[PDB]
Design a protein around this motif. Structure first.
Motif, PDB file in Angstrom:
ATOM      1  N   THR A 268       0.951  -1.287   0.158  1.00 51.88           N
ATOM      2  CA  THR A 268       0.167   0.093  -0.091  1.00 51.88           C
ATOM      3  C   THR A 268       0.743   1.190  -0.028  1.00 51.88           C
ATOM      4  O   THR A 268       0.570   2.201  -0.565  1.00 51.88           O
ATOM      5  CB  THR A 268      -0.872   0.086   1.194  1.00 51.88           C
ATOM      6  OG1 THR A 268      -1.814  -1.380   1.296  1.00 51.88           O
ATOM      7  CG2 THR A 268      -1.896   1.255   1.122  1.00 51.88           C
ATOM      8  N   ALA A 269       1.897   1.260   0.636  1.00 51.13           N
ATOM      9  CA  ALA A 269       2.996   2.310   0.770  1.00 51.13           C
ATOM     10  C   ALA A 269       3.577   2.656  -0.574  1.00 51.13           C
ATOM     11  O   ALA A 269       3.760   3.585  -1.266  1.00 51.13           O
ATOM     12  CB  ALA A 269       3.989   2.106   1.783  1.00 51.13           C
ATOM     13  N   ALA A 270       3.850   1.241  -1.226  1.00 56.64           N
ATOM     14  CA  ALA A 270       4.513   1.420  -2.489  1.00 56.64           C
ATOM     15  C   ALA A 270       3.652   2.033  -3.616  1.00 56.64           C
ATOM     16  O   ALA A 270       4.186   2.251  -4.651  1.00 56.64           O
ATOM     17  CB  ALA A 270       5.044   0.003  -2.915  1.00 56.64           C
ATOM     18  N   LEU A 271       2.375   1.682  -3.361  1.00 55.68           N
ATOM     19  CA  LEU A 271       1.247   2.287  -4.428  1.00 55.68           C
ATOM     20  C   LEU A 271       0.797   3.892  -4.118  1.00 55.68           C
ATOM     21  O   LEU A 271      -0.051   4.245  -4.599  1.00 55.68           O
ATOM     22  CB  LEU A 271       0.026   1.414  -4.600  1.00 55.68           C
ATOM     23  CG  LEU A 271       0.158  -0.150  -4.741  1.00 55.68           C
ATOM     24  CD1 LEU A 271      -1.083  -0.780  -4.536  1.00 55.68           C
ATOM     25  CD2 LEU A 271       0.757  -0.167  -6.089  1.00 55.68           C
ATOM     26  N   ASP A 272       1.759   4.213  -3.076  1.00 54.11           N
ATOM     27  CA  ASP A 272       1.575   5.699  -2.687  1.00 54.11           C
ATOM     28  C   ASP A 272       0.109   5.947  -2.176  1.00 54.11           C
ATOM     29  O   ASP A 272      -0.316   7.297  -2.271  1.00 54.11           O
ATOM     30  CB  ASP A 272       1.730   6.871  -3.802  1.00 54.11           C
ATOM     31  CG  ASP A 272       3.137   6.737  -4.552  1.00 54.11           C
ATOM     32  OD1 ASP A 272       4.092   6.326  -3.861  1.00 54.11           O
ATOM     33  OD2 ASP A 272       3.169   7.001  -5.493  1.00 54.11           O
ATOM     34  N   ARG A 273      -0.606   5.072  -1.599  1.00 52.15           N
ATOM     35  CA  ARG A 273      -1.814   5.253  -1.058  1.00 52.15           C
ATOM     36  C   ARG A 273      -1.924   5.763   0.440  1.00 52.15           C
ATOM     37  O   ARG A 273      -1.228   5.146   1.092  1.00 52.15           O
ATOM     38  CB  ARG A 273      -2.984   4.004  -1.425  1.00 52.15           C
ATOM     39  CG  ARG A 273      -2.935   3.437  -2.481  1.00 52.15           C
ATOM     40  CD  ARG A 273      -2.967   4.409  -3.649  1.00 52.15           C
ATOM     41  NE  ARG A 273      -4.250   5.223  -3.275  1.00 52.15           N
ATOM     42  CZ  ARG A 273      -4.552   6.245  -3.601  1.00 52.15           C
ATOM     43  NH1 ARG A 273      -3.464   6.969  -4.273  1.00 52.15           N
ATOM     44  NH2 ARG A 273      -5.663   7.064  -3.207  1.00 52.15           N
ATOM     45  N   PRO A 274      -2.757   6.613   0.936  1.00 52.26           N
ATOM     46  CA  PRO A 274      -2.809   7.047   2.313  1.00 52.26           C
ATOM     47  C   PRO A 274      -2.953   5.634   3.003  1.00 52.26           C
ATOM     48  O   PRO A 274      -3.834   5.093   2.647  1.00 52.26           O
ATOM     49  CB  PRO A 274      -3.758   7.975   2.436  1.00 52.26           C
ATOM     50  CG  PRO A 274      -3.746   8.707   1.106  1.00 52.26           C
ATOM     51  CD  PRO A 274      -3.607   7.563  -0.056  1.00 52.26           C
ATOM     52  N   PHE A 315      -7.425   9.654  14.557  1.00 50.92           N
ATOM     53  CA  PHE A 315      -6.020   9.724  13.928  1.00 50.92           C
ATOM     54  C   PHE A 315      -6.364   9.888  12.581  1.00 50.92           C
ATOM     55  O   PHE A 315      -5.650  10.632  11.992  1.00 50.92           O
ATOM     56  CB  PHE A 315      -5.496   8.260  14.277  1.00 50.92           C
ATOM     57  CG  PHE A 315      -4.005   8.384  13.937  1.00 50.92           C
ATOM     58  CD1 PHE A 315      -3.036   8.509  14.930  1.00 50.92           C
ATOM     59  CD2 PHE A 315      -3.441   8.304  12.377  1.00 50.92           C
ATOM     60  CE1 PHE A 315      -1.699   8.793  14.483  1.00 50.92           C
ATOM     61  CE2 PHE A 315      -2.304   8.430  11.997  1.00 50.92           C
ATOM     62  CZ  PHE A 315      -1.224   8.510  13.073  1.00 50.92           C
ATOM     63  N   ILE A 316      -7.255   9.012  11.879  1.00 44.82           N
ATOM     64  CA  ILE A 316      -7.414   9.260  10.461  1.00 44.82           C
ATOM     65  C   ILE A 316      -7.999  10.812  10.204  1.00 44.82           C
ATOM     66  O   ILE A 316      -7.485  11.309   9.178  1.00 44.82           O
ATOM     67  CB  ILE A 316      -8.493   8.297  10.111  1.00 44.82           C
ATOM     68  CG1 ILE A 316      -8.274   6.762  10.002  1.00 44.82           C
ATOM     69  CG2 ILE A 316      -9.054   8.795   8.649  1.00 44.82           C
ATOM     70  CD1 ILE A 316      -9.295   5.980   9.738  1.00 44.82           C
ATOM     71  N   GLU A 317      -8.787  11.237  11.048  1.00 43.85           N
ATOM     72  CA  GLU A 317      -9.290  12.572  10.917  1.00 43.85           C
ATOM     73  C   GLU A 317      -8.101  13.548  10.996  1.00 43.85           C
ATOM     74  O   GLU A 317      -8.241  14.633  10.295  1.00 43.85           O
ATOM     75  CB  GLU A 317     -10.454  12.740  12.086  1.00 43.85           C
ATOM     76  CG  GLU A 317     -11.518  12.025  11.992  1.00 43.85           C
ATOM     77  CD  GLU A 317     -12.787  12.391  12.664  1.00 43.85           C
ATOM     78  OE1 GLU A 317     -12.311  12.011  13.835  1.00 43.85           O
ATOM     79  OE2 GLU A 317     -13.944  12.715  12.589  1.00 43.85           O
ATOM     80  N   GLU A 318      -7.173  13.480  11.917  1.00 41.34           N
ATOM     81  CA  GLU A 318      -6.091  14.608  12.246  1.00 41.34           C
ATOM     82  C   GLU A 318      -5.037  14.042  11.174  1.00 41.34           C
ATOM     83  O   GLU A 318      -4.004  14.991  11.241  1.00 41.34           O
ATOM     84  CB  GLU A 318      -5.846  14.422  13.699  1.00 41.34           C
ATOM     85  CG  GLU A 318      -4.672  13.713  13.918  1.00 41.34           C
ATOM     86  CD  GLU A 318      -4.437  13.499  15.494  1.00 41.34           C
ATOM     87  OE1 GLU A 318      -4.523  14.769  16.197  1.00 41.34           O
ATOM     88  OE2 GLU A 318      -4.158  12.376  16.029  1.00 41.34           O
ATOM     89  N   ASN A 319      -5.036  13.255  10.516  1.00 44.39           N
ATOM     90  CA  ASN A 319      -3.857  13.056   9.621  1.00 44.39           C
ATOM     91  C   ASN A 319      -4.304  13.061   8.033  1.00 44.39           C
ATOM     92  O   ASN A 319      -3.983  12.463   7.143  1.00 44.39           O
ATOM     93  CB  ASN A 319      -3.428  11.515   9.719  1.00 44.39           C
ATOM     94  CG  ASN A 319      -1.960  11.685  10.604  1.00 44.39           C
ATOM     95  OD1 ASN A 319      -0.965  11.793   9.831  1.00 44.39           O
ATOM     96  ND2 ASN A 319      -2.131  11.399  12.014  1.00 44.39           N
ATOM     97  N   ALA A 320      -5.449  13.892   7.914  1.00 41.72           N
ATOM     98  CA  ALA A 320      -6.135  13.932   6.628  1.00 41.72           C
ATOM     99  C   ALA A 320      -5.555  15.254   6.154  1.00 41.72           C
ATOM    100  O   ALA A 320      -5.562  15.352   4.696  1.00 41.72           O
ATOM    101  CB  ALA A 320      -7.701  14.311   6.729  1.00 41.72           C
TER     102      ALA A 320
END
Ligand code: ADP
Length: 320
Positions: A268-274, A315-320
């Motif tokens: 997932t990191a390799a596909l550049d996805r959050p 976390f997801i909210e504050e890392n948007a």
């Protein structure tokens, strides 16, 4: 220039190698790579534009009945495939005696690898023609970039590494790309799993958002867990069984991802996805993902049972 790469195992380790091929292609036009890799990950290198031949090995499987006629055949076909071409350079990015003695040693071409001081297993350096000093205290992606750089005669770019495999999927992204998120719940160690109870609570918190969630699975027990997590949530879907390339496509189309410390998280990191990776017994500083939009979420007391769905969303909210 045609180079041979020896980096067979750990999906993650294979994936972290991609940014190095990208640096090389940009600095040395026309350079192509052949890659010896574990059969289970054989599809990963084919996604990179600089890769030509993919040569699969199956050391662990072969080790259980090494002299059987069936395996003897596979091994014979392997050595012949490995020794077919004469390379301008062979780069062992693994630094383990086992693959150095079984793969690297048999390749035709100048062999590059990590020196006695920096190889995973020091003795592995004895099998190379050129031993390079690659500092241990930096991300695996950077170390491999440094290795490729010193081996091929170019200075490592100061820009962030680019896996460059996303492009392979953007041409045929799922129709519903961006309409969903993917939750990677499956891994290998009991303590690395985020308790199901918490996954459901997180899923629940998103019920009225309008987002859809897809759950991948590799083995039967994982599917069962997947079915238990989706139970009751109409916006949640359990994916069918698929190949790496298959689950790769789904990830590529995910708006973002929540995951445990596992290979698919590295993909997932390799596909550049959050991606929000949640850690417990393993440390991200040592074995964490590389990629900018990669967000680390440590569990309280490194115990995932103590990580609330609330904190993961907060976390997801504050890392948007
Ligand atoms: N094609 C796939 N679809 C879904 N999950 C997969 C697939 N291939 C491997 N996995 C998952 O990856 C894990 C095993 O290896 P790995 O990802 O490297 O994990 P770990 O880093 O915990 O050892 C398992 O949980 C397995 O189900």
């Amino acid at each position: 220039m045609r180079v041979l790469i020896v980096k067979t195992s750990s999906m993650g380790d294979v994936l972290h190698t991609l940014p190095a091929l990208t640096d090389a292609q940009q600095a040395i036009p026309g350079i192509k790579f052949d890659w010896v890799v574990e059969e289970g990950f054989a599809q990963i290198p084919s996604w990179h534009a600089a890769v030509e031949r993919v040569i699969p090995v199956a050391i662990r499987r072969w080790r259980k009945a090494w002299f059987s006629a069936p395996i003897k055949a596979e091994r014979k076909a392997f050595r012949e495939a490995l020794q077919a071409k004469n390379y301008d350079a062979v780069i062992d990015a693994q630094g383990l005696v086992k693959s150095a003695a079984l793969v690297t040693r048999l390749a035709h071409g100048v062999k590059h690898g990590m020196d006695w001081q920096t190889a995973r297993e020091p003795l592995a350096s004895l099998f190379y023609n050129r031993k390079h000093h690659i500092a241990k205290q930096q991300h695996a992606v950077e170390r491999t970039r440094e290795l490729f750089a010193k081996s091929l005669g170019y200075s490592k770019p100061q820009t962030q590494g680019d896996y460059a495999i996303a492009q392979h999927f953007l041409t045929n992204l799922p129709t519903d790309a961006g309409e969903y998120a993917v939750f990677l719940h499956a891994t290998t160690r009991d303590d690395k799993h985020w308790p199901e109870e918490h996954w459901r609570e997180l899923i629940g918190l998103l019920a009225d958002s309008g987002i859809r969630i897809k759950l991948p699975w590799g083995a039967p027990h994982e599917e069962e867990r997947a079915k238990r997590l989706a139970e009751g949530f109409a916006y949640v879907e359990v994916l069918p069984k698929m190949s790496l390339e298959g689950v790769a496509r789904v990830l590529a189309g995910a708006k973002f991802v929540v995951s445990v410390d596992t290979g698919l998280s590295h993909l997932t990191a390799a596909l550049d996805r959050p991606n929000i990776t949640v850690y417990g017994p393993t440390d991200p500083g040592l074995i964490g993902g590389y990629g900018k939009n990669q967000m680390v979420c440590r569990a309280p007391g490194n115990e995932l049972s103590q990580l609330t769905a609330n904190a993961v969303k907060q976390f997801i909210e504050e890392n948007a």
